[PDB]
């Protein structure tokens, strides 16, 4: 259920490291499916969000920094034996490298 799926995300993403974080507001997590646009039969299973930079009239670092995992997504690519907690797992920190890399990469 989504609710379980919610409840996985939060418990794995306490796991992870605080120092990890820095920089981070957090990890959203969205019930509908995402597909990767236009290579079909791929769906995407998170993201991260990155403000980007900066326009004439002003910076989008208050809109924060997060990673989104896509449920719908997930069920999509479930079959069976599908591992809920590694898939999540490596989704999330796979994000939070992005989340690195971009902060390095203004600093």
């Given at each position: 259920t989504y609710e379980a799926f919610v409840e996985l995300v939060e418990r794995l993403w306490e796991e992870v490291?605080?120092?990890?974080?820095?920089g981070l507001q957090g990890v959203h997590v969205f019930p509908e499916a995402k597909p990767?646009?236009?290579?079909?039969g791929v769906w995407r299973l998170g993201e991260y969000l990155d403000p980007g930079p900066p326009s004439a009239f002003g910076?989008?670092?208050?809109l924060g920094r997060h990673i989104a995992l896509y449920y719908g997504s997930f069920l999509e690519v479930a079959?069976?034996?599908?591992?809920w907690e590694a898939e999540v797992w490596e989704t999330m920190l796979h994000e939070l490298r992005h989340h690195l890399e971009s902060l390095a990469g203004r600093d």
């Open positions: 490291p605080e120092d990890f974080k820095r990767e646009p236009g290579l079909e910076g989008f670092e208050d079959g069976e034996g599908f591992d």
